[PDB]
Every structure is written in structure tokens, then in C-alpha cells.
């Protein structure tokens, strides 16, 4: 019954800066016979399997960059990155193996970077979809920072909120940006009643909304 707790739950750091994340066990993981702490750290980048970084509290696995250091003893452990890189974006897990095995709940490391405006693209429904009876209009808001962003859809100049779903990606491991898709789904019958379809992106990077539009009559 060993309880493992991690802090912080998340945090954001700029490339080149130090970060420290902590891991606490409800009981000592210092094994008296081997004289080592049975505590390992794992990195899980978005969409990938966990990878071992550190074991026995402070032993760095081969291949792991030297900017990663494990420290601590007994009930308190830390993982420190001396100078963070874009690719260090991940959830980090500590794990005890003193008595069976137990993972902490993880710390999500985000990368802070300079603000960046989104590149916006809009796409009409395909003829294959329309022939089938549906009409999805898609807008991509790509490679921006910070994560918070608003999208407004206009049909013939009037705002439409019904039928809009959004999805953000995880942060990019190369440029530290986010992207988001907005998809407006309508029936073919209602789609064919209007001409102008507009996706409007509002981001802190501009007081002016970025607007993309197409006209059915122009297809």
C-alpha cells in the first residue's frame, strides 16, 4: 500500500531554463539490504510509450541526455532538467518498485515560448460528403501560442454557434506551438441555403481577428 504523489501537476518553462519536479512516497523506498532507493522516473512524450530516464533514484539510463538528473532518498525524490529543450515536452512519472510497483500521477511539462499568430485555413464540404447528405466545414488554426484561442463561424455574415466542435493538438515537440481544428457540421439542405462561410480566429497576438471565408457560388 504505497501511495505515490507528484507535484506540480503541471507547469510551463522556457527553453534553456531549469525545471524541478517532485515525487513523494508514503513510505521509505530505501532498501536496507541493497542500500538503494527503488524509485524510477519515466518520460512519456505525447502519443508515445513511456521511456525510462532514471532508476535507483539517481542512476541515469544509457542514452538519456545529461541534462536529466534524479535525486533524493527515502520518501522524497526529484527529477531536475538543468536546461530544458523543446523536445522535453512530456508527462513525467515516478514509480516505486520497493513493494510490487506503483506510479505517481505524473507532472505535465509544457514549454513556454514567444507569442505566435495562427495560420488559418478553411475548407468547404467535399462533393463525396455532400452527395451522401452531409456538410462539414473545416477550419485549421495552426501553429500558434499561447494555447487559448477563440473561433467564430459566420454564415452569410451572421454568427452560428450550433454544430461547432473544436479540438486542440498537444504542444509541438519542435516549435512549441499549438494547433486547433474547428468543424462546423450542417445538413446538406441548410448548407445549400447560404453562400458565405467564414471562419474568424481571435488570438491575443492581434486585436484584429484573422478571417478566412469561401463562397458556395465560387466553388
Amino acid at each position: 500500500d504505497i501511495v505515490m504523489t507528484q507535484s506540480p501537476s503541471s507547469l510551463a518553462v522556457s527553453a534553456g531554463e531549469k525545471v524541478t519536479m517532485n515525487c513523494k512516497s508514503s513510505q521509505s523506498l530505501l532498501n536496507s539490504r541493497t542500500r538503494k532507493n527503488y524509485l524510477a522516473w519515466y518520460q512519456q512524450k505525447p502519443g508515445q510509450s513511456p521511456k525510462l530516464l532514471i532508476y535507483w533514484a539517481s542512476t541515469r539510463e544509457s542514452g538519456v541526455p545529461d541534462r536529466f538528473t534524479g535525486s533524493g532518498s527515502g520518501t522524497d525524490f526529484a527529477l531536475t532538467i538543468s536546461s530544458v529543450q523543446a523536445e522535453d515536452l512530456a508527462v513525467y512519472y515516478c514509480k516505486q518498485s520497493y513493494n510490487l510497483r506503483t506510479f505517481g500521477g505524473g507532472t505535465k511539462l509544457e514549454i513556454k515560448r514567444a507569442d505566435a499568430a495562427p495560420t488559418v485555413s478553411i475548407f468547404p464540404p467535399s462533393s463525396e460528403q455532400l452527395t451522401s447528405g452531409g456538410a462539414s466545414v473545416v477550419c485549421f488554426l495552426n501553429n500558434f501560442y499561447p494555447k487559448d484561442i477563440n473561433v467564430k463561424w459566420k454564415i452569410d455574415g451572421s454568427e452560428r454557434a450550433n454544430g461547432v466542435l473544436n479540438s486542440w493538438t498537444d504542444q509541438d515537440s519542435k516549435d512549441s506551438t499549438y494547433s486547433m481544428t474547428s468543424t462546423l457540421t450542417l445538413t446538406k439542405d441548410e448548407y445549400e441555403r447560404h453562400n458565405s462561410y467564414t471562419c474568424e480566429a481571435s488570438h491575443k497576438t492581434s486585436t484584429s481577428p484573422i478571417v478566412k471565408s469561401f463562397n458556395r457560388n465560387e466553388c
Binding site: L52, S97, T102, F103, F140, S167, W168, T169, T181
Partner: protein
């Protein structure tokens, strides 16, 4: 090369049973404990159990969360590890990973599989519709897409030009609505490369054995 590959994942009804398998190569199988670990979508890693090595007589242990309900076994002639899961419920929906565990000395999970996704649901399998997102209109770069709509269960995979276009790709997390998922993918290329050179999204939906190619046309 150490290799661990999970298989068996997919849709099962609540109350049903499912067995996962983990095929291994590149190391002396019998020398190692092997663990299973799971992760619900967007949640934390959970250790489930292990089976010890030959030195320890291949005995098993389990987390309290699954003891009495999940069964681990191994085939030492084939270097294979199994997880039998019984009386499944919604909390069991997760990616399952097999990991190489203790060798009588090292305390670490040195190697992990790619993981296999189990969905526990009564909803029916439904293949995706796949639609091209061709760009309207004059810049240096151009963005194209594919809309992958109306499928169940996860996952689906999307590549562009059979994986040769890897930079400048964004595949957006699926969203669930009415027991069906939708996702889209964008790719951004130089305008000198399309439509002059082809761009095709390749979509797979393992649950329905669906394989789709949609070339993006002007």
C-alpha cells in the same frame, strides 16, 4: 534490438473478456519479470501486475485494482506474455503496455511495447468516412487536409504519402459525439509541390480493417 509488441486490443462489451498478448524478441526471455501497465485516455499510468522469472518460479502478483479479475501468463518456448481480462467495465478502457521488468538485479522497466487500446462499450463498430480537404486560394506554403468522420471505436491512423510527409503534419485528437468519433488531419507543404506532386492521406481503422487512400485533387 529488444522488441515488445502488444496485440489483441479492441472493442469488447461490458461484462465480456479479452486476452492481450505481448510478443518479445532480442533478449533472454526467461531471465526477466514482465509487467503489464495500463493508461486510460489522457490519464495516468497504472501498474497491473507481473510474472516473475525462471529463477523465481514464474509466480504472479497483481495490483489490488485487478487481482482476482485479470490473469497473467507467459509462453517461455515462444518468449510471449499474456494478459487475460475478465468482467470488463468502463474503467478498463485504456491502452495496455507490456514492459520488461526485474532481472534479479536491476530495478527498472527498461523496455516498453507500443501499447494496444481496449475500449469497453456496447456501441457498435462503425468504419470512418474519409473526405479530402482541398485548399481554395497563392503563398509559399499550402495546407491540405482529410476529414475522418463517424467511426467507432478508436483508434485510427493517418499518414500522408505513406509516411514520407511527416513534418508539418497535425492530426487532431478525435472528438466523441453520439457514440461516434471524428478527427481531421492537416499537412502543410510548399506550393511548388502540389498539385504538381501528389498528396494523399492514408487512413486505417483497425477495428473495421478499413484501409483508405484519398488523393487530394484540385
Amino acid at each position: 534490438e529488444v522488441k515488445l509488441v502488444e496485440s489483441g486490443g479492441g472493442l469488447v462489451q461490458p461484462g465480456g473478456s479479452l486476452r492481450l498478448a505481448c510478443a518479445t524478441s532480442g533478449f533472454t526471455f526467461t531471465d526477466y519479470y514482465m509487467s503489464w501497465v495500463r493508461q486510460p485516455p489522457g490519464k495516468a499510468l497504472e501498474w497491473l501486475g507481473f510474472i516473475r522469472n525462471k529463477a523465481k518460479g514464474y509466480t504472479t502478483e497483481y495490483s489490488a485494482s485487478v487481482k482476482g479479475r485479470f490473469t497473467i501468463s507467459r509462453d517461455n518456448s515462444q518468449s510471449s506474455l499474456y494478459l487475460q481480462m475478465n468482467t470488463l467495465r468502463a474503467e478498463d478502457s485504456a491502452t495496455y503496455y507490456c514492459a520488461r521488468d526485474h532481472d534479479g538485479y536491476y530495478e527498472r522497466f527498461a523496455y516498453w511495447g507500443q501499447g494496444t487500446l481496449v475500449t469497453v462499450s456496447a456501441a457498435a463498430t462503425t468504419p470512418p468516412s474519409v473526405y479530402p480537404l482541398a485548399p481554395g486560394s497563392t503563398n509559399s506554403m499550402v495546407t491540405l487536409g482529410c476529414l475522418v468522420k463517424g467511426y467507432f471505436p478508436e483508434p485510427v491512423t493517418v499518414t500522408w504519402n505513406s509516411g514520407s510527409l511527416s513534418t508539418g503534419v497535425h492530426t487532431f485528437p478525435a472528438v466523441l459525439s453520439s457514440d461516434l468519433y471524428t478527427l481531421t488531419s492537416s499537412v502543410t507543404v510548399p506550393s511548388k509541390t502540389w498539385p504538381s506532386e501528389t498528396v494523399t492521406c492514408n487512413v486505417a481503422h483497425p477495428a473495421s480493417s478499413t484501409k483508405v487512400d484519398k488523393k487530394i485533387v484540385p
